[PDB]
């Protein structure tokens, strides 16, 4: 976790970080209903 440093080539680490973003993205919706019309 965090941003101290990296331990080496760990794709799994970056994958879980990308996953966190998508999860959180849909977890907290913004203050406005900005959805796509069709």
């Amino acid at each position: 976790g965090e941003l101290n440093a990296i331990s080496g080539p760990n794709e799994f680490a970056e994958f879980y970080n990308r996953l966190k973003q998508i999860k959180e993205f849909h977890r907290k919706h913004p203050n406005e209903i900005c959805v796509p019309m069709s």
Binding site: E14, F15, R18
Partner: protein, 85 residues
């Protein structure tokens, strides 16, 4: 210079007083991104990386698309082939 964001909250944040669906039409924006993300990484590191995920998350239905048992597998496998080069 017009860059500014307004990020405030309110004490009134009730639950969604709307209905629910049971397996709606087309893939959700969430899963869409998850499949792409996965398909991009597997295409960048090779099948070995993919197979590892298929082991560690075998009991997580969200990774079941990696198996041909899901229709999403078709979309996913076709995406890997496009992300590889």
């Amino acid at each position: 210079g017009a860059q500014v964001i307004q990020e405030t909250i309110v004490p009134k944040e009730p639950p969604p007083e709307f209905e629910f669906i049971a397996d709606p039409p087309s893939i959700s924006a969430f899963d869409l991104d998850v499949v792409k993300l996965t398909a991009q990484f597997v295409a960048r590191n090779g099948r070995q990386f993919l197979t590892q995920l298929m082991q560690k998350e075998q009991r997580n239905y969200q990774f079941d698309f990696l198996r041909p048992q899901h229709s999403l597998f078709n979309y996913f496998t076709k995406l890997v082939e496009q992300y590889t080069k």
